[PDB]
Amino acid sequence: QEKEFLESYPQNCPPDALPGTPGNLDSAQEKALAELRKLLEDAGFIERLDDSTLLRFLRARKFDVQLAKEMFENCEKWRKDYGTDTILQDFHYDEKPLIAKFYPQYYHKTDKDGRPVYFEELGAVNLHEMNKVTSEERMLKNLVWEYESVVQYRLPACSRAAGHLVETSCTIMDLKGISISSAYSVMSYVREASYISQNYYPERMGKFYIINAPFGFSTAFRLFKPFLDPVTVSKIFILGSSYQKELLKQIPAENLPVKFGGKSEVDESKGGLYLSDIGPWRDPKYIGPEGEAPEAFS
Ligand SMILES: CCCCCCCC/C=C\CCCCCCCC(=O)O[C@@H](COC(=O)CCCCCCCCCCCCCCC)COP(=O)([O-])OCC[N+](C)(C)C
Ligand SMILES: O=C(c1ccc(Cl)c([N+](=O)[O-])c1)N1CCN(c2ccccc2F)CC1
Fold this sequence. Notes:
monomer, Helicase, Ruva Protein, domain 3, CATH 3.40.525.10, 9% strand, globular
């Protein structure tokens, strides 16, 4: 199944993409990739040795082969202990219709480069109400579940729809309603989620828009700017109460939801935006041999 699944969708990043992305390797990047491939092979590894996976790890370690082998090995260790390799069957987030309003997290269509768009309304989160029903451990299970649906279903379909490899998502994080107090209360979840993201899903973040940022924090960020990695800085966007134009630059109006200033609508019979999962991975044109992605609840 390994070799056919990847033949089922375009595997080249567009050429104007960052160096070391599939299809765009120079000689040395190619040598390093072959080298790390063989080094993992000899260690007795089989699956997930494709070009995309390994160039993500390498980009994450600036193509240092040894540290990339390291990070890969730790990631597989975590996959075994956590049960990731089967979570899509094992875990069932039956509470979602109940607690979605208390931490809106949802995927919706694609940006102009073909990336699935991911939305988190962090500033509206109410862990008081969420903790009446579920736990942080289960929230993180759902997050990994969603990441696995991204990798196994959302990205292959997005790649077919865009005509080229799609490896990343475009995140929109709404800060409207945030406070120091609610920051402390979400701190533990956000830090766990980040750890998972950076270490077991490297280079999956393509854009990261913060919107309704408080005036203070964005001024601060412009001064603090040199302290971050320049690539990371170019993927980040701080915006205030008027973000609609800058979002509509990156996401077609019929893809971006109305409440953020586009034209895309969801009908509230199914439970509206917070419970939806609309995009090319639900489109018969783009669903491939992997089948359609599972729904999160029934
Ligand atoms: C080199 C020298 C440079 C330094 C000098 C700098 C000079 C500084 C000068 C002036 C500044 C004035 C200070 C007051 C600012 C208060 C704002 C504030 O605290 O924000 C809020 C907290 O909100 C947050 O927590 C903000 C960030 C949200 C989370 C970011 C992403 C998290 C998820 C991603 C994680 C990783 C994802 C990826 C992981 C893989 C509190 O809101 P508030 O109190 O109601 O705001 C007041 C309103 N006002 C600000 C307009 C008045
Ligand atoms: O690195 C990521 C990330 C990680 C895995 C996957 Cl599968 C994807 N993806 O959809 O292609 C993105 N993200 C940046 C961090 N983001 C995040 C981290 C912590 C809290 C909230 C957040 F939105 C989530 C998205």
